Amino acid sequence: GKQCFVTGRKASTGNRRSHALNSTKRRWNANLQKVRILVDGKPKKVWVSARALKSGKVT
Amino acid sequence: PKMKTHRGAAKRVKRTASGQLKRSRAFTSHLFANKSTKQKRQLRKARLVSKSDMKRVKQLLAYK
């Protein structure tokens, strides 16, 4: 699917429990954002997680 | 495989020298305003399991 460009962040899978511990499978997505970052060859717009966008990037 | 012991029986008994088991007494948990002061004082002493239950539950304690 999608995944963070700079780092490798990607959705994981786990359980979701009720108040009686009834388990049911669910996902945990990453906080991906469409950001136009500046690589040479061309400035391209890619997925980047908001965790990598803090403190250091080109935009 | 190795035979598995009963883990909830092993928390309620202990083996004497003859091989008899020393159990504890039921009816000593709560509601003490309803039991006599003599029937409360004699439920405080441990006793041995019977011949019949030893007939029944004695493989569950083959390692104890």
């Binding site: - | 009963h6 504890s24 039921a26 539950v57 569950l60």
Partner: protein, 144 residues
């Protein structure tokens, strides 16, 4: 002689074979009685609890704990000390090589059941208060 062999008398028996004839008395039903849950390939009930009324170790209360630093001692009564000649300062090394103690668990403890009747110099980890008197009333000392 390999053509003339006999087991010791009373050493071997015939196994019993059910399901083979009525003369045996185990041929039909194989000693399992008539229709029931105890007469089915598979089996009966779990041992002890049956699914019925409340089991015995679910009707009595639990008790006590287990001490993690429980120290157990290898016991040596006084009478086992008689296998040693007079003098012969006894230590946990000589006491294991001699052949009285096998597994020095947390040390050795000299207990006082029996008669000493010798003049030893026992060096152990702990003494009983009725073994020190015995080891010192026949003449002799004891270091811990």
């Amino acid at each position: 002689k390999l053509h003339e062999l006999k087991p010791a008398e009373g050493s071997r028996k015939e196994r019993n074979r059910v399901g083979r004839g009525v003369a045996t008395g185990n041929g039909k039903t194989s000693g399992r009685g008539h229709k029931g849950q105890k007469a089915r390939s598979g089996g009966g009930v779990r041992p002890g609890f049956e699914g019925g009324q409340l089991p015995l170790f679910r009707r009595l209360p639990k008790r006590g704990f287990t001490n993690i630093n429980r120290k157990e001692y290898a016991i040596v009564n006084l009478d086992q000390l008689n296998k040693f000649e007079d003098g012969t300062e006894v230590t946990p090394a000589l006491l294991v090589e001699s052949g009285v103690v096998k597994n020095e668990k947390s040390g050795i403890k000299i207990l006082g059941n029996g008669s000493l009747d010798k003049k030893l110099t026992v060096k152990a980890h702990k003494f009983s208060a009725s073994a020190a008197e015995a080891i010192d009333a026949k003449g002799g000392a004891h270091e811990v």
